[PDB]
Each structure stands twice: as structure tokens, then as C-alpha cells.
JSON list of C-alpha atoms in Angstrom, two decimals:
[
{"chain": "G", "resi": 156, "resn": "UNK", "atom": "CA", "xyz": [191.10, 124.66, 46.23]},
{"chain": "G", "resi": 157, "resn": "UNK", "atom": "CA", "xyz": [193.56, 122.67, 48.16]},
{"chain": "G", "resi": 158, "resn": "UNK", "atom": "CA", "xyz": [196.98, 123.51, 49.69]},
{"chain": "G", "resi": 159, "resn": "UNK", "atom": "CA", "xyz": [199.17, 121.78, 52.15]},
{"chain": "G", "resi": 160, "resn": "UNK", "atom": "CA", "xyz": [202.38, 123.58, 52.30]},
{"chain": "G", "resi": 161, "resn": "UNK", "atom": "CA", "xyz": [205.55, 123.44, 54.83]},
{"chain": "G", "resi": 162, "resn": "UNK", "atom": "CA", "xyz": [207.70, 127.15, 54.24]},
{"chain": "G", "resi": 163, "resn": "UNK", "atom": "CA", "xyz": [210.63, 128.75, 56.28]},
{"chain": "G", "resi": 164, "resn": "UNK", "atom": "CA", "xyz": [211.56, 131.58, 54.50]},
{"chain": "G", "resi": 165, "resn": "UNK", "atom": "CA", "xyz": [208.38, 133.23, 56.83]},
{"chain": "G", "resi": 166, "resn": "UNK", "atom": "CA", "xyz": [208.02, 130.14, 58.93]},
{"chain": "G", "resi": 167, "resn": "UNK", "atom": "CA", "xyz": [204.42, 128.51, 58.08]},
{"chain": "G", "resi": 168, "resn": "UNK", "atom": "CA", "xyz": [202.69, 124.88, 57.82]},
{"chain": "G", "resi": 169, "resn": "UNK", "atom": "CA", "xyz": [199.59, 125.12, 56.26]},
{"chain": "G", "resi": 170, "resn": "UNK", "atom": "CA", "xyz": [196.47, 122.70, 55.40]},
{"chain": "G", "resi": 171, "resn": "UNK", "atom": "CA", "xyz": [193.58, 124.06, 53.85]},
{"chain": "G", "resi": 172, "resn": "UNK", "atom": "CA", "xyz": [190.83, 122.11, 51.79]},
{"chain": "G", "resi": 173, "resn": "UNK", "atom": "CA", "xyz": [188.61, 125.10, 50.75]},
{"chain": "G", "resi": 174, "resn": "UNK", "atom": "CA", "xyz": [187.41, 126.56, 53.84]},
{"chain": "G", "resi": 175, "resn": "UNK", "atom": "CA", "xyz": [188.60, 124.39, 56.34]},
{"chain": "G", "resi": 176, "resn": "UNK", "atom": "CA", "xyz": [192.42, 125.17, 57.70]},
{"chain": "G", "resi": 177, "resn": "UNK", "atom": "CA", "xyz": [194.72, 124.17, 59.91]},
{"chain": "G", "resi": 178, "resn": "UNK", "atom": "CA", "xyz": [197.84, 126.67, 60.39]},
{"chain": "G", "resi": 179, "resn": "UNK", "atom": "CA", "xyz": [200.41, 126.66, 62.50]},
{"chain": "G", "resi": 180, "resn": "UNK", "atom": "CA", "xyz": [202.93, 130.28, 62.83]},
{"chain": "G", "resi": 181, "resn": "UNK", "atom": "CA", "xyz": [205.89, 131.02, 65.55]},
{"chain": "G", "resi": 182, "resn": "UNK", "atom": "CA", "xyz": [202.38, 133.18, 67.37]},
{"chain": "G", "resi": 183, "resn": "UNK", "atom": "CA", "xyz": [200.50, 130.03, 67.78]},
{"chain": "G", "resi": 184, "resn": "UNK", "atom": "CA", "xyz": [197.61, 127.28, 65.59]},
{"chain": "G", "resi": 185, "resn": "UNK", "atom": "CA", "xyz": [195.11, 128.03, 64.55]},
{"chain": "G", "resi": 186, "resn": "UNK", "atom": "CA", "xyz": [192.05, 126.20, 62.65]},
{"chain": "G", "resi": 187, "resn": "UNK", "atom": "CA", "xyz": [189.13, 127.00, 61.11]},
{"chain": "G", "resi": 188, "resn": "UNK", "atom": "CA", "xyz": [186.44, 126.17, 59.00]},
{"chain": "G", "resi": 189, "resn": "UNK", "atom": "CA", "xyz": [184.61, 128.93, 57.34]},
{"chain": "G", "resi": 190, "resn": "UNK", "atom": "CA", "xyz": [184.47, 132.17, 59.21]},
{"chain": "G", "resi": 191, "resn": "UNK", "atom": "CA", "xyz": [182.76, 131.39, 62.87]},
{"chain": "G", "resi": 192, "resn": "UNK", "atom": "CA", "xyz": [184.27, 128.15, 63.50]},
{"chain": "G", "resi": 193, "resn": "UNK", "atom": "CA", "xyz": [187.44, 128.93, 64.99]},
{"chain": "G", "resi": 194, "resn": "UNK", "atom": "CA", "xyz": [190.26, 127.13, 67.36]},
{"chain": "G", "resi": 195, "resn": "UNK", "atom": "CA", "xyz": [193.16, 129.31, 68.61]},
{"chain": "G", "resi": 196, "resn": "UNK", "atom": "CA", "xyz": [196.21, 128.52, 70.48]},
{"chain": "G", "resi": 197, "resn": "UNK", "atom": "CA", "xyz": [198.76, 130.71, 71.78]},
{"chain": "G", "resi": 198, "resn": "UNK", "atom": "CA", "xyz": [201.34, 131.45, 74.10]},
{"chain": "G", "resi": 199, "resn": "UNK", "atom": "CA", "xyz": [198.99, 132.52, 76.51]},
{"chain": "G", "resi": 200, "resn": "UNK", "atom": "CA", "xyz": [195.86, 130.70, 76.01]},
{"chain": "G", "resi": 201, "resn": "UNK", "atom": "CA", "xyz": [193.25, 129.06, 74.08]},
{"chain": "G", "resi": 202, "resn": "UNK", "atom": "CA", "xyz": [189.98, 130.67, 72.00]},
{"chain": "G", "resi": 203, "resn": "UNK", "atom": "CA", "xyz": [187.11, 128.25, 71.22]},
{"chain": "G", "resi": 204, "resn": "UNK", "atom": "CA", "xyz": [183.88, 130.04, 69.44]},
{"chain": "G", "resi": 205, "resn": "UNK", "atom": "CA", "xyz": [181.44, 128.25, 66.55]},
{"chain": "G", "resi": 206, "resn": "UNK", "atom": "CA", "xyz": [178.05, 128.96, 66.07]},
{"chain": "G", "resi": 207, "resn": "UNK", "atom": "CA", "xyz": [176.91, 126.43, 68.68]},
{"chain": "G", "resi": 208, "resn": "UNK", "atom": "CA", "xyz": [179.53, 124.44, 70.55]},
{"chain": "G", "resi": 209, "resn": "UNK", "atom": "CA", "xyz": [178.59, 120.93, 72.29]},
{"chain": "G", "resi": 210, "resn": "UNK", "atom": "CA", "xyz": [181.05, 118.98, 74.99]},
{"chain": "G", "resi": 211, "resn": "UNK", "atom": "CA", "xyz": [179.81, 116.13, 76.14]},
{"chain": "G", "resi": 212, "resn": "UNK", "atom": "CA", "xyz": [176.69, 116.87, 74.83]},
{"chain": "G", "resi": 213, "resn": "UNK", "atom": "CA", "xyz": [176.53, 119.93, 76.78]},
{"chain": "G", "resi": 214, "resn": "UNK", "atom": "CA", "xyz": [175.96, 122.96, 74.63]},
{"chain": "G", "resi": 215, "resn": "UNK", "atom": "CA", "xyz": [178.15, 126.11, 75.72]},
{"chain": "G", "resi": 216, "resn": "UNK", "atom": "CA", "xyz": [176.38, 129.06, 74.95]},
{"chain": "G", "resi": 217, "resn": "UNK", "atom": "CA", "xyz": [177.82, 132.28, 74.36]},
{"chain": "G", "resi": 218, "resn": "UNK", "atom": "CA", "xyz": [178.82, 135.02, 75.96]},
{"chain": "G", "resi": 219, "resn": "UNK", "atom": "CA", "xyz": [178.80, 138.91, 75.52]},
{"chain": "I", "resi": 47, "resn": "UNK", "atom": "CA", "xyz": [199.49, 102.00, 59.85]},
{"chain": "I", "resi": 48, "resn": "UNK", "atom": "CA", "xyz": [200.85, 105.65, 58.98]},
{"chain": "I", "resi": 49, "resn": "UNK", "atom": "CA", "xyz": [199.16, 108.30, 56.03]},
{"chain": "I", "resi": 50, "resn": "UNK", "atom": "CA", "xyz": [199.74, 111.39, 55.34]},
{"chain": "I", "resi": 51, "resn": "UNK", "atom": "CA", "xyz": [198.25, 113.00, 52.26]},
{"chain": "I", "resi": 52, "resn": "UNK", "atom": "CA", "xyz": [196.66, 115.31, 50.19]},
{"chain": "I", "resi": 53, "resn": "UNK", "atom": "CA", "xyz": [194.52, 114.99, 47.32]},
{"chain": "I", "resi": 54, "resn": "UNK", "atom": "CA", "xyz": [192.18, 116.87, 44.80]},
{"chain": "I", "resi": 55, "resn": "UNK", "atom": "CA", "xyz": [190.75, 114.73, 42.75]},
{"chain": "I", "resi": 56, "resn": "UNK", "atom": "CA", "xyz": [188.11, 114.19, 46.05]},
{"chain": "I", "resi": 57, "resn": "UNK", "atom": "CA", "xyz": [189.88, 116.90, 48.18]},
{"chain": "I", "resi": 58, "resn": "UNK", "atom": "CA", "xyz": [190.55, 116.09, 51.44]},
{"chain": "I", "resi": 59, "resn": "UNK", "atom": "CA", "xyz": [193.70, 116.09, 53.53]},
{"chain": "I", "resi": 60, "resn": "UNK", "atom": "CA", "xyz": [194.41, 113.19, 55.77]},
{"chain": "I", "resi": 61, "resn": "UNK", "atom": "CA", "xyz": [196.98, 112.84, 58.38]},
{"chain": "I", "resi": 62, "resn": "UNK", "atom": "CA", "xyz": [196.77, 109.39, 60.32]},
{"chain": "I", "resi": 63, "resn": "UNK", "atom": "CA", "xyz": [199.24, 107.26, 62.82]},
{"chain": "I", "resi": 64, "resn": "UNK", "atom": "CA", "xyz": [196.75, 103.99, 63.58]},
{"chain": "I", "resi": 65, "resn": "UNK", "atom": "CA", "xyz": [193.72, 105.63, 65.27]},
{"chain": "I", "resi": 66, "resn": "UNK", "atom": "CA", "xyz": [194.67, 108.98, 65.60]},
{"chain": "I", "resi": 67, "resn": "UNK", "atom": "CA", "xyz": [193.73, 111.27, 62.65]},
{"chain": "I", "resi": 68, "resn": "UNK", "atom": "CA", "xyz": [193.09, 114.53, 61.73]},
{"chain": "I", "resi": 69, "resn": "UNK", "atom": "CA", "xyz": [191.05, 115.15, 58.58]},
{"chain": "I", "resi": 70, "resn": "UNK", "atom": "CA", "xyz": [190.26, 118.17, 56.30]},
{"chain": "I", "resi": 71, "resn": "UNK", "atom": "CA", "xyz": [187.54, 117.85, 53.53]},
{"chain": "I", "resi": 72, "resn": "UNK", "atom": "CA", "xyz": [185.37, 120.77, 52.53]},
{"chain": "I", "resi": 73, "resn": "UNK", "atom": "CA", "xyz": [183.01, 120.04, 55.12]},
{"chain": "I", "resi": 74, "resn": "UNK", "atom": "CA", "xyz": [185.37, 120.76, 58.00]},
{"chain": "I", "resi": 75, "resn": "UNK", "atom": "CA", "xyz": [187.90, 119.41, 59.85]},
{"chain": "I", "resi": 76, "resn": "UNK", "atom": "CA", "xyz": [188.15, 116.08, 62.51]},
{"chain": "I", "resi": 77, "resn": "UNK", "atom": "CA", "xyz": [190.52, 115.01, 65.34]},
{"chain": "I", "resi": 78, "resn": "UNK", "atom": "CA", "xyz": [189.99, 111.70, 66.51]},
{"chain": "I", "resi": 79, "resn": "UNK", "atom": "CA", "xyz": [191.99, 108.80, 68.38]},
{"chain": "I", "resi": 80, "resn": "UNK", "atom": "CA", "xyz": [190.27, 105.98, 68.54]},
{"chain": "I", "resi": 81, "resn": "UNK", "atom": "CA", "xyz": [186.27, 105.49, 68.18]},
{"chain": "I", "resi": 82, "resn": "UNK", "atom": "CA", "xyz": [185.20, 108.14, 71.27]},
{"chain": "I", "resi": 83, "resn": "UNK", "atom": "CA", "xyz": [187.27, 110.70, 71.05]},
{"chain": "I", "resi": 84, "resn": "UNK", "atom": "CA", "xyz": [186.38, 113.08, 68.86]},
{"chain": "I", "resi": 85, "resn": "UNK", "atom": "CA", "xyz": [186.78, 117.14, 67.67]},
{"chain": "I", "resi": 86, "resn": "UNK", "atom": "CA", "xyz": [184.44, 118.14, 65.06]},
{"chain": "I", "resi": 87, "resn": "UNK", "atom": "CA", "xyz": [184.67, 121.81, 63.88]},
{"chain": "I", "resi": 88, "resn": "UNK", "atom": "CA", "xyz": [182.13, 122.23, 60.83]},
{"chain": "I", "resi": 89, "resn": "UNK", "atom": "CA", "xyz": [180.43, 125.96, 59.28]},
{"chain": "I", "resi": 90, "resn": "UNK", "atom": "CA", "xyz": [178.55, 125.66, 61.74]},
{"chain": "I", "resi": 91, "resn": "UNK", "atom": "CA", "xyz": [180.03, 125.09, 65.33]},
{"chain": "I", "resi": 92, "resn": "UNK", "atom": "CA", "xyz": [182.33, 122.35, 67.16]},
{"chain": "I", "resi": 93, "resn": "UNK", "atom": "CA", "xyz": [181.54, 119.44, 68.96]},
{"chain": "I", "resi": 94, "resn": "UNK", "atom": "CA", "xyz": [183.85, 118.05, 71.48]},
{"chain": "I", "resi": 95, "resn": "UNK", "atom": "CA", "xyz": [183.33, 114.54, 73.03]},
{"chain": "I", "resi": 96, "resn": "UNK", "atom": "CA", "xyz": [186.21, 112.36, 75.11]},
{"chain": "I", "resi": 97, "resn": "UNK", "atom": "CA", "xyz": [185.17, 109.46, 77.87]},
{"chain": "I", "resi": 98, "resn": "UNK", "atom": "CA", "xyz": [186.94, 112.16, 80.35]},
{"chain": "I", "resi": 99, "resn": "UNK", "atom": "CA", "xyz": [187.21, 115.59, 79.23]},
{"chain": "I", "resi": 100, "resn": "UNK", "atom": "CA", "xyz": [188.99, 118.30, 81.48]},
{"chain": "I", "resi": 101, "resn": "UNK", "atom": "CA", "xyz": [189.28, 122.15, 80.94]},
{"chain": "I", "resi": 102, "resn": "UNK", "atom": "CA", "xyz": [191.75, 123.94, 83.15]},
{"chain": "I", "resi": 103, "resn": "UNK", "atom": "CA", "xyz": [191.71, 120.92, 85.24]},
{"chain": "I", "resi": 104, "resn": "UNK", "atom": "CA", "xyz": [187.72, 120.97, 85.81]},
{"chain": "I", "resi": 105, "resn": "UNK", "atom": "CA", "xyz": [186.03, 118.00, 84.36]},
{"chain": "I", "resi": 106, "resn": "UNK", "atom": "CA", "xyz": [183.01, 118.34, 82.02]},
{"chain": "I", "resi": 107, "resn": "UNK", "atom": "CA", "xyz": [180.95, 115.33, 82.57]},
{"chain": "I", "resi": 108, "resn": "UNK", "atom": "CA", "xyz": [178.34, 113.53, 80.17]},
{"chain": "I", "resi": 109, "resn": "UNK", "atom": "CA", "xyz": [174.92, 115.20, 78.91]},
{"chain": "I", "resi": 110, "resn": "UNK", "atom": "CA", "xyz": [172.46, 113.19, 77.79]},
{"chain": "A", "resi": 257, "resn": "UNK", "atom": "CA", "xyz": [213.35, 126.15, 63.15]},
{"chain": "A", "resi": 258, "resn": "UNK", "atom": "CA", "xyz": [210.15, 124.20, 61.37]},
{"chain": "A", "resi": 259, "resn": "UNK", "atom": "CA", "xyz": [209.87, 120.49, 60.70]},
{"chain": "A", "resi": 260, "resn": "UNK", "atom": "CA", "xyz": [206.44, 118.80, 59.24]},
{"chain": "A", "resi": 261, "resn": "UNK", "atom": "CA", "xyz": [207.49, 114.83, 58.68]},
{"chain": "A", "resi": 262, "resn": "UNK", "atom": "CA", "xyz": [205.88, 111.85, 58.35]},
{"chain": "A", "resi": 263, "resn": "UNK", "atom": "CA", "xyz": [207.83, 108.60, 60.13]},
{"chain": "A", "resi": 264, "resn": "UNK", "atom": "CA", "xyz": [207.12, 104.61, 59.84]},
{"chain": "A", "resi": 265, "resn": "UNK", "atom": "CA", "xyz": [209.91, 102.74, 61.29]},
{"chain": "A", "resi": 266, "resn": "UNK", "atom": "CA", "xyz": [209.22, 104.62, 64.97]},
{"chain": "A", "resi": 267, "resn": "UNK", "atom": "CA", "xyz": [205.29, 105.41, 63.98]},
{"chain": "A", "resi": 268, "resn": "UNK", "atom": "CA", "xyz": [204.42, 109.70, 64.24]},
{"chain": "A", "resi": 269, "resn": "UNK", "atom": "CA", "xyz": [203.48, 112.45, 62.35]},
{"chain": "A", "resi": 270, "resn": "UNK", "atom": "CA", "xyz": [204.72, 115.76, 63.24]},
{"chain": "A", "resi": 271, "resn": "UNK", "atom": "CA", "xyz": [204.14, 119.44, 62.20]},
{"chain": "A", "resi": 272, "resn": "UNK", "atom": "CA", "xyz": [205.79, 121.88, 63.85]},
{"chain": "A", "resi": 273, "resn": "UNK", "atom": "CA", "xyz": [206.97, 125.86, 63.68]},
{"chain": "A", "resi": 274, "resn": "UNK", "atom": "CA", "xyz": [209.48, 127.10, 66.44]},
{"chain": "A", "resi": 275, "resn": "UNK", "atom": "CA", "xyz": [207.20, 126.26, 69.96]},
{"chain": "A", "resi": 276, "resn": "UNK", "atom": "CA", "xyz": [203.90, 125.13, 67.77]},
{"chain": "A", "resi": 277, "resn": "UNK", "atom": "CA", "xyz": [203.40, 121.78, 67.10]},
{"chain": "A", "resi": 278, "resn": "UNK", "atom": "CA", "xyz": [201.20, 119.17, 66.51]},
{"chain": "A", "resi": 279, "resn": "UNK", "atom": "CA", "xyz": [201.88, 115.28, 66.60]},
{"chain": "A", "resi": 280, "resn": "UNK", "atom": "CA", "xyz": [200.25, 112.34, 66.20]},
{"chain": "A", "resi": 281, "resn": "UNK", "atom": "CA", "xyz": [201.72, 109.15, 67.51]},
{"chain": "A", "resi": 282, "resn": "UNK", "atom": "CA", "xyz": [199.30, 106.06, 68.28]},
{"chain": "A", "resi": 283, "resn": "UNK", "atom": "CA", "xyz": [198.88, 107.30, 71.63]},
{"chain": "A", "resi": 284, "resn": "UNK", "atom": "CA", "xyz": [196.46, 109.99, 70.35]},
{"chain": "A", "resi": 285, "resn": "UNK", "atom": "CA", "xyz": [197.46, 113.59, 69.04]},
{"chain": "A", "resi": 286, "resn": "UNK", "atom": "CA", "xyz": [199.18, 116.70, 70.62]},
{"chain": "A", "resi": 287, "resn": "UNK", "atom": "CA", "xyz": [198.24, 120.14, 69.80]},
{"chain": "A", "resi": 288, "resn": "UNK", "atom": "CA", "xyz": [201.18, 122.89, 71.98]},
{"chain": "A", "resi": 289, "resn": "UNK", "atom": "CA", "xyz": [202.31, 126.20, 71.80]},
{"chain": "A", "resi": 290, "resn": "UNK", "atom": "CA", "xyz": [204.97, 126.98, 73.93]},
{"chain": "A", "resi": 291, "resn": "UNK", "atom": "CA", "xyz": [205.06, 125.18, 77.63]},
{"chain": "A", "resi": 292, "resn": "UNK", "atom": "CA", "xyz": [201.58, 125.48, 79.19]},
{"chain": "A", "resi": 293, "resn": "UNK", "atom": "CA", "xyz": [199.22, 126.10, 76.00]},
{"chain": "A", "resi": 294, "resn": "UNK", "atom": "CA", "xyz": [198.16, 122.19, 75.19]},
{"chain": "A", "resi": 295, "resn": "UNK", "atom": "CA", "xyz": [195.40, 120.30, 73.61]},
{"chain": "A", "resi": 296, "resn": "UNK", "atom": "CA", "xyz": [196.10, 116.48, 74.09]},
{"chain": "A", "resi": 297, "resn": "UNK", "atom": "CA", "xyz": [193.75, 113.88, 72.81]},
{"chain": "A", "resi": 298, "resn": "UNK", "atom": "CA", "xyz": [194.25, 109.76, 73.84]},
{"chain": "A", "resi": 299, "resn": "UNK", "atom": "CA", "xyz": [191.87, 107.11, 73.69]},
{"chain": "A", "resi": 300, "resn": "UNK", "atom": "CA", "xyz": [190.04, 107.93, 77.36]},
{"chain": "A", "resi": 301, "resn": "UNK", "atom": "CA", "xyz": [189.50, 111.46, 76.61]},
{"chain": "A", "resi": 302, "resn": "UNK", "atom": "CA", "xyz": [190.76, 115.57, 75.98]},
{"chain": "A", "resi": 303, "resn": "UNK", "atom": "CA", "xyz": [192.12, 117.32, 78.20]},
{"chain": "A", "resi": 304, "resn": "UNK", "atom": "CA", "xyz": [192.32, 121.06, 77.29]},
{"chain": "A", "resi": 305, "resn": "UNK", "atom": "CA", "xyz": [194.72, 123.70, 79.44]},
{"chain": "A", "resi": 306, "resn": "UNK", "atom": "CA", "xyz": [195.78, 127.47, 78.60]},
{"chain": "A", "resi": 307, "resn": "UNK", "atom": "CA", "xyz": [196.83, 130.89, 80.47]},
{"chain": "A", "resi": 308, "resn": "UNK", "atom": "CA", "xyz": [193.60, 132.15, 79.43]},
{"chain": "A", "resi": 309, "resn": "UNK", "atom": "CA", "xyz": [190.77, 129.83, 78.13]},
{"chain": "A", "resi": 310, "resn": "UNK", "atom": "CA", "xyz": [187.84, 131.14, 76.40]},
{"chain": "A", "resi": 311, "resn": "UNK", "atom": "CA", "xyz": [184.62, 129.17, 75.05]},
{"chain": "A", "resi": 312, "resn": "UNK", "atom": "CA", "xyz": [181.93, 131.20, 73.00]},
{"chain": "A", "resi": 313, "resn": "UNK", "atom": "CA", "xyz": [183.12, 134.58, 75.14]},
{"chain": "A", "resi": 314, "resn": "UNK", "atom": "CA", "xyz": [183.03, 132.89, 78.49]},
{"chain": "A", "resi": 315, "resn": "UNK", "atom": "CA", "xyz": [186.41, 132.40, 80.20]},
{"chain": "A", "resi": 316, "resn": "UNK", "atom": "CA", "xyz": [186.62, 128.64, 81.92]},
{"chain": "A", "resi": 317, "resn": "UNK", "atom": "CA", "xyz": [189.03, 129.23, 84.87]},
{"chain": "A", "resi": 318, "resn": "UNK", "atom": "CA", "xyz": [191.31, 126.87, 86.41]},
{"chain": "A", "resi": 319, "resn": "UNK", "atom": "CA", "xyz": [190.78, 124.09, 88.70]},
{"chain": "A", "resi": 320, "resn": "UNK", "atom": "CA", "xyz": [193.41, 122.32, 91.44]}
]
């Protein structure tokens, strides 16, 4: 399904188009697209994982 | 131009001030401003690409 | 507060919730929560700076 939605009351903006979202709360944004490709943002940082991530052309590899 | 809109029928979510864009379709989800800068999140990872990119101030240069 | 608007005439989208936001002017696009957590994109490039920044596990540290 689809929903793009702007609520405060609690205090959300959402876009999704099935499994692809964008969300954005008072902790922070997040998006996603299925369940490994994820972009966080909050107050104190940034997370970055998918199942293989290229910059530049550079693949980052991960790290356990 | 300026769109911003949401549609199933086919689903996709579109959010666009001249070249900058974000995107949502079932395949994932784009950020782009103009024709080389690019974030691609998709099932299966991310690519990043920018004529300069920097991370915490350190620049990630070109792989080809 | 929370505000997600779309504006031609003076061009920008914006989506935000208390100290998350993202805009999109035709400069490029902004991605922030709170002061020092920020994703900007612009024609030349990304540039990518939080508290804590983590790619695939592995923490990119800063750079002056």
C-alpha cells in the first residue's frame, strides 16, 4: 500500500510506498526500504547499513 | 518547477523543487539534485555518489 | 510543533517534526536533526556530519 501522512496528535510525517519509508519523529528520520536498508538520523549521530553500500564507487564493507 | 505527490494508481511518492527530488516507488527510495548527485537506498544496499563527498569532514574520493 | 508544506511563489518543500526536518529548495535538499546531525545534498556533492557516524558497523571519525 501507500501512505503519506502529516499527524500531531503524536507528532509524525510519514511516506511509505510498500516497503520503502521515509519517517520523520521528535527522536530523529529515519528511512528505509525493506528490512536491511536503513538510514538513521538522530540527535547524536547518523547509522548507515544495507546489504552492500557503495560511495563513490567505493564499497564499504561491514563491520562486526 | 515544484511537485509534491502521491499516487496509487502506479504508486510512487514524489517530492520535487527543480532538480532536487526525493522519490519513493516500491523499488526504493532516491535523493537527487541535479544529474550527479545521487542517494539510492534499494532491498538491497545504498549507493552514494556526489562530485565531492565528505564524512565528518574527511573526503571520500572517486573509485573507478 | 510539525509543518510538512509545499510552496511556489518562494520555491521549497518542507517536512518537518520539532528539530527534524527535511527541505528541498533548488539549491539541493537538507536532511537535520537537531544542530549538528545533517545530511545536505547540492549540485557539487554530499556532505554527511553526526556526533557519532556509523557505516555497515564501522564508525567514520571526524576530520579538521
Amino acid at each position: 500500500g501507500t501512505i503519506a501522512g502529516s499527524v500531531h496528535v503524536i507528532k509524525e510525517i510519514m511516506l511509505a510506498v510498500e516497503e520503502s519509508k521515509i519517517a520523520l519523529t521528535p527522536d530523529g528520520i529515519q528511512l528505509q526500504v525493506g528490512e536491511s536498508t536503513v538510514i538513521r538520523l538522530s540527535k547524536d549521530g547518523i547509522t548507515i547499513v544495507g546489504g552492500s553500500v557503495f560511495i563513490n564507487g567505493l564499497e564499504h564493507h561491514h563491520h562486526h
